[model samples]
Target: GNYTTAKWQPAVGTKWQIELLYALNDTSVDAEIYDIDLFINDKSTIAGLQRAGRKVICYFSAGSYENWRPDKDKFKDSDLGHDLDDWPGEKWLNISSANVRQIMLDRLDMARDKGCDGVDPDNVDGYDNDNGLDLTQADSISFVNFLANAAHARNMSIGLKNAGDIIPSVIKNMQWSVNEQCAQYNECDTYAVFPQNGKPVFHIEYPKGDKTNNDLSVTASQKNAACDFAGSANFSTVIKNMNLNNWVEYC
Candidate 1:
C-alpha cells in the first residue's frame, strides 16, 4: 500500500470529542477523532463515527499489560516488568517479546477489521519509565518501527504516544503524536519534532481535576508560556480532565 502524510492528517479544523471509555451521546458535536478503547469500541462506534464523517483512532496499550483486559491471561508473568508508577493494575511489558509483538499485530488486525482509520498505541515509551526490562533507546526505536510496519501493512495510520526521547528517529514513520501533559511537564519541545515535519501533535493537558471542568484553570501566564512553544507549529492542543472526558479547552 502506498503511504503518504496526507492520508493521515486529521480532519482539518474540526471539533474532536475523545472519550476514553464512555460514550459522548451528543451527536451535535463534530467528533473528528474518537480515541476510544481498542477492544471496548466495537464496529458500531466506528460505524457511528464514520456515519458522522469523522475519523476514529482506536486506543490500546502496545507496551504494557493490564490485569483487567480479556487478553490478560495471554501475557506471561515473565513478560511483565516494573509497575507503572501511577497506574494500578498495569505493568510494563518487554516490547522485545515476539509474543507481545504478535499480540499487538493481532490488535492491529482487529482495528482494521473494525474499520478504524488509525490507532493510538499507548505506552510505547516504556524505555523512559522505570520499566524493569532494561529497555534501551534502540529497543524502543526497533519496537516502534515494528509497530509502524505492522499497522501500515493493515492500512491503519499509527501515532506515537509520548515517546519523546525517540521522536526525532520515529517521526518519519508515524502519522502523528498523541502526547499527555507535554505542556504541564514542560516537555512539549520533544514532540515539536512531528509538527516541524508538518505532522500534527495531538497534545492533551489535564489542567482540571477529574470532576472539575476548569478549562480556564490555566492562568494567563501558563497560557502565554504554552502558546509560545516554538515547536508547537500546527499542534492540536486541548485541555481536559485527567479522565479525558468530552469537555475541552483548546490552546
Candidate 2:
C-alpha cells in the first residue's frame, strides 16, 4: 500500500496529557492534546474535548491482542504470541497476518467515526520481545507504514509508540512519536529524532512506579531523572503514576 500523509501534524513542544486506564473524567488539564483510549471513550467524550479546542489522540494496541477488548473475539488463536511481560492479559500479534491487518483497518475506521484527530498505537516493538512468531524489525516497519496509510485515509493522524528501532523507516509516516521511559532507559537522545524532525515526542515517565496516590509528588531529583535528561528539553514530557490516572506533572 502507498503511504498516505496526515491532515494534522502535531507540532514539537505541544502540551499534552494521556490517560488510558479508564474513560477520561478529567478535562481539567489545560493541554493542547489529550491521548486517551479508543475503545474506552465514546464520540461525545471526544467531541466535548474538541469543543474546548484540544486535539484528541485515541490510544490502542495495534500490535497486541488483549483479552478484554470489545473485539477480542475477532482474533484467531494462531495470531496470538507470548504474553507481554508484566501485562498478563495482552499478547503480541503476528504483524504480517492478513486477519490482524483487517482488524486494524476496522479499528482505524472506528477511530475516525469516533471523532479522533489522531491515534497512538502501542506495542509495535514485538520483535524486541520473545514473541512466539518470528516478527522482525522489517515487519514492524511495514506494519507501521500500513497503519499510517490506513489512519491518513480516514483523515486521522498516527504516531509511533515506543518502537525507536524502526523510527528511521517509519518517521515519515508518523505525525509524532508516543514514547515512554526513554528517560529511564537513557535513550532520550535516540527519540529526540522526533523533535529534531519538527514532530512532538509525547514522552512519559513513571517515576512514581506502582504508586497510585495522586497526592504524592516526586522529589526534585526524581523529577529531574524523568525530565532534565539529555535530548528531552524539546519533549512534551509528563510525570504520572504507573496506572496513568488523572494526575500529571510537567517538566
Candidate 3:
C-alpha cells in the first residue's frame, strides 16, 4: 500500500537491533527494525535489511561532535565545548550554532540517502550533562524540533535518543524513542509515556557495565533485571555491551 511506503510509524514492542561500533554483519537477529551507523554502513546493506522485512533506522550523534567522524572538519572549533565526560575525542556541540544545525541537516540527508526508514539520533540531552556550553532544556527542545522538522521534510522518521525530560515537549515530532540505561537508572518510568501514546521505545541496557567485553551470554540475574524491568513490558528492550557491538540478548 502507498501508506506503508510513505514513512515508518512504529508502535509499542517493535523489535529492533542497534549496533553502532561497526557494520551490521549479522542479520540473524529477528527484528522488525535495524538501527545501524549511517556512515559506517553502506546503502546496499540497508537495502538488504529492508529486503529482509526490517526497517532500517540510521544512527548518528546529533548533539555532539566526534573528531573521528568523516565530516568532523565541517564543525567550527568554537561550536564545540567541553569533553563529554568519559568519551574521548568527542565534545558537546553548541546546539544553537548555525554550522552545527546545518551539519545535522546534512547528516539527516545521509540517512535518507542511505535508505533509512528512520533515525536514532543520540546525545540530544546535552543540557543534562556538564556540557560547558550552558545549553538549556529549552535549547534542546528547540533543537529537537528543528531536527524533527528537517527529517519530516525529507520523508524520513526520527526518534528521541535519551532525552526523557523533553519527551513531553517534543513527543509530537518523534516517531519513537531510543533509550539507554533507563532500567539501570530507575528511569524506565520516564519513557513509559511513549508506549502510552502508542509509540515504540527502542530501549537498551549495558549489563556488562562500562568495560567492553564480548560476553554475549549474560548471567541470569543481570539478564532478568535488564530484560524485565518495570514499565518496560511493551518496550523493545535489548541487553548489549558498553561498546554496542554485535552481541545482544533479549527476553
Candidate 4:
C-alpha cells in the first residue's frame, strides 16, 4: 500500500544510456539513467552502475508476451492473446489473466534480484490497440497498479509505460512516464502532466524514418517541436530508433 518517488529524475538534456544486451560496454557517458532489459541485466552490470552513482531502470513488457522469452512456454494458449500490431515475434497478453500476473510477479522478482532502482514495463496500454482480448483502460490501470505494488514491495520504483490517459488516477502511484512518439503523434501534452507533479516524462521520438542511425540533425524541427511542449519543462525527449536500440539523438 506504500509507493515512494524515485530518488532521481530523468529529464530533458539529461544523458541516458539504454542498452539491453549483455553488459553495458561504456560507463563514461554520464547517463542519468540506464534502461536495460529486465531479465538480461545481471548483478555485475547493476553493481557497476551503482558504483558509478547512476540509476538503473530495468525494462520489460508488462502488457505483451515475447515468444522467445525463457518463460514463453509457461503461458497457456488461453493466456496468450493476439499478435502485436507491428512486432513480429511478440503478442499482446491477457493482462487480466491470473497466470499472466504470476509471470509478471516473477519478472518483478527478477528486477529486484538484479538490483535495479526502477522498472520500465512496456506495452501496458493494450486497450488502445486491437488486442484480441477485450482489454479496457480499467484493465490497464489495474495491471499497472499490480506492477507498482509488486515493485514497491521490493523497494523498487515503477514507471507508467505510455498509458497517458490513466495518468490522473495513477499519478500518485507511478514514479515516471516512459512515452514513445508523443511528439510525432502530437500527444506530448498528454504526458506533460507528470512534470506538473514534479515527475519526469521521458519521451522518445522515432524520426529516423527507418530506424537507421541517420543524422538526427535532419529532424531538428521535430525535436524543437517536442521540446517546446509548454508543460514539458522537465520532460526528457530523445530521438531514437523504433527498435529502441542504444542509438539516441537528443533534443
Candidate 5:
C-alpha cells in the first residue's frame, strides 16, 4: 500500500454521527460521516459503510489504557498512569514513553488495515486531567503531531479529540475536531477555530434522559443549549447518551 496522503477530508460544516456500542449492531445511521469503534467492528463492517457512501472514522483510545481492549496486555505497568476520573477500567497513558508511542503506531496500522477513512484518537487530553504521569500540554502536542503524521503516512485522516489547549499547535495537522460537551463547559468558542479553518468539529453532548429505559428524548432547553452553542452553528453536533449507544439526536 502506498501510504503518504489522505484519501478523504470532510469539508467545513460536514455532518457526522458517532456510536461506540459494540453490541448494539446498528450501522445504518443516515449521516455523511460515521465514527465507530475501531476494534469492535470488523473490516467488512467498515467496508459495508463505505459502500453505503459513508466515510468511516475509526475510534480508539490513544492516551489511555483500557483493560478491556484487545491490546491491553501489551501495555507495561510503567506506561500506565492514574485512573481516569469517571471512566472505569481505564488509566491515563504515559504519552511520552517510547512503548506507548509504538503501541499507538501499531494502532494506526490497525486502523489502516481495518479500512478506516479517518481516525478519532480519544483521550489525548491527558494533560488536562490528574494524569499521574505529569503529562503536559507540550507532551500532548508532540504526541498528537506524531499520531497525525503516522495517520497521514497511512493515507488516513485524523482528528483532535477534545484537546482544546493544543489546537493552536496541532490543528494544522488534524483534519477535524472531536469535541465533547463544549456547550456544557462553555468552551465552544475555543473549538470554533476548527470550522474557521475549514474543518468540521464533530461535537457530542450528553444530557439527562431515561438512562434505564434508553429514552432518546431531550428537552427544548437542553436541545437549545447544545445546538445553539456559542460559535457552534457550523459544528456537527449530536446529542447522545453517556454510554454513546446507537440512539442519537442530531442538531
Candidate 6:
C-alpha cells in the first residue's frame, strides 16, 4: 500500500503558467509552476517538465462531466446535471453523488500516477451556477474537504478552483487557488484571502487579445489592465486568451 506521490506547496507569490490547448508541444514557458491539461498530457511530458525544474499541476474537471475525456463513459446518467452554458459537450456533475466523488478520486490518482506535483481541479463552484443538482455551499465545502483529504493521503497537493465563496470553510485544507477573471469581475478583493494566508492565487484574466487570428500577442494596455487589479498585488496573475491556448502573457 505504499503509493508515491510528489508534494508541492507554492508560496503566496509563486509564478505560474497554464496551457490547455491540445497538441501544443511547447512547455518551455518561463514560470516556476505549469498547470496543463491532465488528459492531453502524458506521464513522459510531466516528467520532462519536472526534469526542467518546473512543478506541474495537472488540470481536470472535478465538478463537471466532459464527454471527450477517456473516463467519460464511467459517468452515469444520474451523475450528470445541467449543461454548461457556453461550453459544448460539458455538463455540471452532481458533486454530492457517490459516483461523482469516486470519479474525482480516481482523477486524483491519475494526477499522482502521472507525476504531477499537484492538481488544479476546476469548476468546484457549482453552487454559484444554475446547476440542476441544487448543490449547496455546504455540499461544495464537504466535497472539497473530501478531495483535499484524499489528495493529501496520496501525497499530492490539491487547489481550490474559483470557488471563492467557500474559502472560509475550505481554505485551510487547500494548497492554493486557481482563479479566473477576478479583475474583470472586480472580485479581486474576495480572492485576496488566499495570498494573505500564504497560498498563491493563480489568477487569470482574458482581455481583448487576438483570439480570432491566434497571433499569440497582447497590447500594452491589455496587459496593464489585466495585471492592475485593485487587491491582487501578491497574486500570481497571468493574461491568457479566452480559449486558453498555448499563448500567455504573465504579470
The top-ranked prediction according to lDDT is 2
TM-score of 1: 0.87
TM-scores of the candidates are 0.87, 0.97, 0.95, 0.90, 0.94, 0.93
Q: Which wins on TM-score, candidate 1 or candidate 3? A: 3
lDDT of 2 at 30: 96
Cα lDDT tens digits for candidate 2, 1-251: 34678879988999999998899999999999999999999999999999999999999999999899989999999999998886769999998999999999999999999999999998899999988899999999989999998898899999999988889899988999988899988999889999898999999998877644565788899899999877776899999888888889988
What are the lDDT figures for the candidates, one per model? 0.76, 0.91, 0.87, 0.78, 0.87, 0.84
lDDT of 1 at 35: 75
lDDT of 2 at 98: 98
Off by over 4 Å in 2: 210-214
In terms of TM-score, how similar is model 2 to the real structure? 0.97
Best-matching candidate per TM-score: 2
RMSD of each: 3.0, 1.4, 3.1, 2.4, 2.8, 3.3
Cα lDDT over the full model 1: 0.76
In angstroms, what RMSD does candidate 2 have relative to the true structure?
Answer: 1.4
Runs of candidate 5 exceeding 4 Å displacement: 1-7, 209-213
- For candidate 4, the 10 contiguous residues with the lowest summed lDDT are 1-10
| TM-score, cand. 4 | 0.90
Q: Residues 1-251, candidate 1: write the lDDT tens digits.
A: 32334266663233455667465444455546767777876798789888877888888898889887887888777889999987788899999998888888888899999998888888988888899999888888888888887887788888889878888777777888888878767888777777666677877766554455633466676566555566554677766677765666556
Show the lowest summed lDDT stretch of 10 residues, model 2.
207-216
In the range 1-251, model 4's lDDT, one tens digit per residue, is 34444444554345566665444566665668888887766799888888888888999888898877898887888977788978888889999999999999999898888898899888988999989999999999888888887888888888898888888777778888888878767788788778777677777777766436543464567667656666655777666666665666666
Sort the predicted structures by TM-score, highest score first.
2, 3, 5, 6, 4, 1
- What tens-digit string does per-residue lDDT give for candidate 6 at 1-251? 23222256788888888888674488767888988998889999999888998888888998889999989999999999999886788899999889899999889888889888888888888999988999999999988888888888878888899988999988878888888888878888898988887888999888863345254667888778788876667999988877787877777
Candidate 2 residue 113 Cα shift, in angstroms, is 0.3
Clashing pairs in 5: none
